[PDB]
Amino acid sequence: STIEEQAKTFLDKFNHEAEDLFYQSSLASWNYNTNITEENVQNMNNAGDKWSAFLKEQSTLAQMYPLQEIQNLTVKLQLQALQQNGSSVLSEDKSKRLNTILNTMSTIYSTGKVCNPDNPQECLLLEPGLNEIMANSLDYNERLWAWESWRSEVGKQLRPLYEEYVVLKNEMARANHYEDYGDYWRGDYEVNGVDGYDYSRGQLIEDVEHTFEEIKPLYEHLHAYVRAKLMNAYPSYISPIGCLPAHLLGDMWGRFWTNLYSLTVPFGQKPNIDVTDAMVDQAWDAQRIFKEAEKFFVSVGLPNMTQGFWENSMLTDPGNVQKAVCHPTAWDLGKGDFRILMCTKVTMDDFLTAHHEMGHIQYDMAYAAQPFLLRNGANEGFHEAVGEIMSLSAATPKHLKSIGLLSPDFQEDNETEINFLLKQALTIVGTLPFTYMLEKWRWMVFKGEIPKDQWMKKWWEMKREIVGVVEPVPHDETYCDPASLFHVSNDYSFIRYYTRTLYQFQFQEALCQAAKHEGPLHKCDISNSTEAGQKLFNMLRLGKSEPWTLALENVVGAKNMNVRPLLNYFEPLFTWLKDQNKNSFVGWSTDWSPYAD
Amino acid sequence: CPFHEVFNATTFASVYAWNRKRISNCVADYSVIYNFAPFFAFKCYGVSPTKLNDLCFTNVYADSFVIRGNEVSQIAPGQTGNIADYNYKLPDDFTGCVIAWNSNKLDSKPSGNYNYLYRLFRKSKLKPFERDISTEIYQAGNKPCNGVAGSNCYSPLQSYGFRPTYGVGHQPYRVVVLSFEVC
Ligand SMILES: *[C@@H]1O[C@H](CO)[C@@H](O[C@@H]2O[C@H](CO)[C@@H](O)[C@H](O)[C@H]2NC(C)=O)[C@H](O)[C@H]1NC(C)=O
Ligand SMILES: *[C@@H]1O[C@H](CO)[C@@H](O[C@@H]2O[C@H](CO)[C@@H](O)[C@H](O)[C@H]2NC(C)=O)[C@H](O)[C@H]1NC(C)=O
Ligand SMILES: *[C@@H]1O[C@H](CO)[C@@H](O[C@@H]2O[C@H](CO)[C@@H](O)[C@H](O)[C@H]2NC(C)=O)[C@H](O)[C@H]1NC(C)=O
Ligand SMILES: *[C@@H]1O[C@H](CO)[C@@H](O[C@@H]2O[C@H](CO)[C@@H](O)[C@H](O)[C@H]2NC(C)=O)[C@H](O)[C@H]1NC(C)=O
Ligand SMILES: *[C@@H]1O[C@H](CO)[C@@H](O[C@@H]2O[C@H](CO)[C@@H](O)[C@H](O)[C@H]2NC(C)=O)[C@H](O)[C@H]1NC(C)=O
Ligand SMILES: *[C@@H]1O[C@H](CO)[C@@H](O[C@@H]2O[C@H](CO)[C@@H](O)[C@H](O)[C@H]2NC(C)=O)[C@H](O)[C@H]1NC(C)=O
Ligand SMILES: *[C@@H]1O[C@H](CO)[C@@H](O)[C@H](O)[C@H]1NC(C)=O
């Protein structure tokens, strides 16, 4: 007889009708993802569209309970996550146009071609052949030709589509009371009505700009080092007080610098640890690796596997004819069914990807008791952090000298310490300025602060101001460089890659403080310490039930993301770097340019 | 005693209408169930599980049904949930024995098995030891529905989706509850 009681009565008929209709779609998708045949494609698309139509009908039905009188918090969260109109609030023609341009953008990105100016019959796609030249070559002109032709002949096709997708998304987000699309994107970190844990969408921006200011005194030194070393592979092309040309960084855009490690290794006379011969000359099969991972996970206090995961998961690659696209994933088909998909081999990198996947699986196993709509990470960035700290801790010499792969003594020196820390920094702290800058640009575009006659100019200005790279050939307002990225064209959010990198390290410095560590942070392990597993499981089993700024307090002790753990983790490399630039010039000026002559 | 006629029927009934078989006055031999199978769950509450053969009473009843996996822990004196409140409630001075075992390979087929229902919408909590076979539209709002599905008027019978590729906790378990009050 209330407008609140008819909420629980309705959520029970939806938390049982969806947990069943979702299993069909998920299983039918798995059946295609591991056995690529023709009939399986339609067998998956059928169930997929069925589940989508069911969700749409439930959404248009649940608009009868006004969110203004619901008093409980869990039912409010469920109704709010189910109520959002999302897209389709536009007219019909507008929605059709938007879908068409999104598909066109994805297709143009996937199948672009760029050839030679002296032989136009031998052009290569992006994935198998271009970012391989951009990753393995060492000649200046070849990298320059690649980086310029990938943006001159595939970028110029995305501008007259982006300049319309922007307007369409702006309208779709303003028809839901958001004031722009950037607010819709940040609407994941929103928390309202907890009295002590409030978090308005407008603050997120500020928070980012108040933590990235604490990283610069390390990124600057890393940058000066990488530059002083690059100036010995391509002499007379880099000036000692300028920026780095944006094509010598290591890949097409400069997102990760990890492909530079062969040029800028500090001590090139010590091979960092790689137990790939001890694994092979001891007859390790593709199943012993997962046994070791499960043993490590049961050491800290998390449950065993489900006994339905060993029978159905596809750990090995089916040889003769079962051609199956295997990018390592961990599935959550529901109803107590957890599976892993990865064409594993016997090397080291897969020995860590196994732990990453089992971390995802432990997370998805912990919160399987909540309702259906709340089975997800606390926000869009917790999942990968939880999955990553495990692999971060499962590659330390104290661990690999106790599992058996390494020798029992294996004398260790500070040189391999520096080596490993730098190889980590060239991927962790080398992608934060770029991510922050790209997200800032996309926000300033969607909000309307940059008129559409000033896109490329502001983009390159911000790249020179923050990241520290400069364009090698002048780019006017006909090109479109940001659209030549994968996450920008297919309409994916990007801010998460900047929050995860923070959360992750915080978790470490929390759990290592429970296991009562002694040395520096990067030599720590959470294995054989049950208190760590308990402190972590206290947060794992929450899902989206509580606001994320609470589940972050249960394990750390703060309320928001911080940046002290990252610098605490990178302190040794920092102390070494600050004593390597006595002669160089830490910093960069925004006036030099490779064409200012 | 005719126990093998209730532990072995080709199919049990669903929970919302369980099957009650009353035992007459004859000789009872429990030595066959005690050494029958793994018996995932077997808890006696009044009678001596190690001395069962030494007592006897007037009448014994055998109820039988099929419930989900993680819900066996609700067939017990004084529990609460979607099963022990709307479908099958045990009193507070229970005296029988609860036994339940796995039947994953007999009641579950691929592509779903929609023949094991369970009612989850009832206006009033069930009094001890009562069954209901009603199939009237449970009306939640304030508007007469006159008997059609729609908004705030839901149909109360919903079926399990039993399938073989489930985790322990959703595979169909078979339950045979004994009550005592023959020798
Ligand atoms: C992978 O998919 C193909 C295509 O469906 C399967 O090939 C047939 O599958 C049906 C469905 O069970 C069988 O009745 C046929 O006998 C299969 N044909 C052949 C030539 O095998 C194939 O079985 C699937 N892979 C596996 C491992 O089952
Ligand atoms: C309404 O809110 C209350 C508390 O605010 C929820 O009560 C919890 O319910 C779960 C499962 O029913 C119990 O495990 C907890 O112990 C309860 N909390 C307390 C403090 O008693 C209730 O579940 C919410 N309504 C719904 C439909 O979930
Ligand atoms: C979600 O979309 C609907 C339109 O599809 C919005 O408008 C309401 O739609 C219902 C259904 O026809 C009408 O009965 C109401 O009169 C409409 N206006 C209202 C409720 O003000 C609806 O407002 C949207 N809700 C949200 C949260 O975006
Ligand atoms: C975690 O604890 C276990 C048990 O305490 C350790 O396993 C034993 O380690 C000792 C150390 O030399 C060996 O002598 C034993 O043979 C090991 N047990 C078995 C069954 O092999 C394990 O080494 C610890 N791991 C870490 C990383 O500390
Ligand atoms: C690694 O550790 C050794 C000591 O264990 C360091 O060697 C000392 O370095 C300082 C630097 O000026 C010298 O003054 C000392 O005389 C060195 N000791 C010896 C015995 O020669 C070494 O510098 C460290 N290297 C790194 C990269 O951390
Ligand atoms: C329940 O029924 C099954 C078969 O419906 C019985 O299994 C029989 O067991 C006897 C003794 O082991 C065998 O000789 C038969 O061949 C089995 N039948 C089949 C079809 O395999 C089982 O014994 C019955 N349970 C009880 C308690 O009587
Ligand atoms: C996990 O499985 C192993 C292997 O069967 C067993 O020895 C161990 O006791 C199990 N632990 C738990 C907590 O289930």
Numbering used by the authors:
A (entry chain A): 19 to 615
B (entry chain E): 336 to 516, 524 to 525
Quote the study's own text:
The Omicron sub-lineages harbor multiple mutations in the S protein compared to the original strain (referred to as the WT strain), which mediates receptor recognition and facilitates membrane fusion with the host cells. Binding of the receptor-binding domain (RBD) to the peptidase domain (PD) of ACE2 triggers conformational changes in the trimeric S protein, leading to exposure of the fusion peptide and facilitating membrane fusion with host cells. Hence, we characterized the ACE2-bound S protein structures derived from BF.7, BA.2.75, and XBB.1 subvariants.
To further analyze the RBD-PD interface in detail, we also determined the structures of monomeric RBDs (BA.2.75, BF.7, and XBB.1) bound to the ACE2-SIT1 complex. These structures provided improved resolution of the RBD-PD interface, avoiding the flexibility of RBD, and were resolved at local resolutions of 2.9, 3.2, and 3.6 Å, respectively. Despite the presence of these numerous mutations in the subvariants, our structural analysis reveals a strikingly convergent binding pattern between the RBDs and ACE2. Of particular note is the single difference among BA.2.75, BF.7, and XBB.1: the substitution of Phe486 in BA.2.75 with Val in BF.7 and Ser in XBB. The hydrophilic side chain of Ser in XBB.1 may disrupt the original hydrophobic interactions involving Phe486 of the RBD with Leu79 and Met82 of ACE2, thereby providing an explanation for the compromised binding affinity observed in XBB.1 and its RBD. The monomeric human ACE2-PD exhibited binding to the RBDs of BA.2, BA.5, BA.2.75, BF.7, and XBB.1 with binding affinity (KD) of 4.80 ± 0.01, 3.2 ± 0.03, 1.2 ± 0.01, 4.1 ± 0.02, and 16.2 ± 0.03 nM, respectively. While the increased affinity of Omicron BA.2.75 and BF.7 subvariants for ACE2 may partially explain their enhanced transmissibility, it does not fully account for the prevalence of the XBB.1 subvariant.
